[PDB]
Amino acid sequence: MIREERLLKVLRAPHVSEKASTAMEKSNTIVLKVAKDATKAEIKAAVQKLFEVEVEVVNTLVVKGKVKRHGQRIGRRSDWKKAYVTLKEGQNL
Amino acid sequence: MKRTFQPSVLKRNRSHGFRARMATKNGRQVLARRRAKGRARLTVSK
């Protein structure tokens, strides 16, 4: 069993975009920003515990951060992990 | 025409990378010199 302490840290934010929206209303899939070191197993456990929904499967990818200038002052944004969480049919969030 | 620089990341790391430098006392002296000078980049290691 994954500690609840751990599960409470792994989900960071919902991800809002046209693709995320289409994923929700076509494939019953929610898109999350999750902790960089979160595994598919942890992500599944967290969503089922914290959002109280049945998860079919988690797909994940690492987004590489862009380089961005800030008044002639350059800096690289952090890489972050995105999770496409497919909910079982009948579940809603 | 074929120029002298033909990049291979594997070859780069094996020739000049951090672990190659640490492998010998002369390599470790390179790192000491570069730290002393205050280089932002000690080696080719990415």
């Binding site: 409470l8 840290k9 960071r12 934010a13 919902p14 920003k33 | -």
Partner: protein, 62 residues
């Protein structure tokens, strides 16, 4: 808030810790969605966790 926490036992503190972590999670979701006006709460809870963890470490004897 260190005084009143120091009275509580290890088990009570462990319970307090989970509560704070759940609050932290809830605030983080609110903040992400853009339904948190009181942004200062995020720091408050974060420092509260640190405080509890400190006291737990003291009562362990470390």
């Amino acid at each position: 808030k260190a005084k009143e926490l120091r009275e509580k036992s290890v088990e009570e503190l462990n319970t307090e810790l989970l509560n704070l972590l759940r609050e932290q999670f809830n605030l983080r979701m609110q903040a992400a969605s853009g339904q948190l006006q009181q942004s200062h709460l995020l720091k408050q809870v974060r420092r509260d966790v640190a405080r509890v963890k400190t006291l737990l470490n003291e009562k362990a004897g470390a």
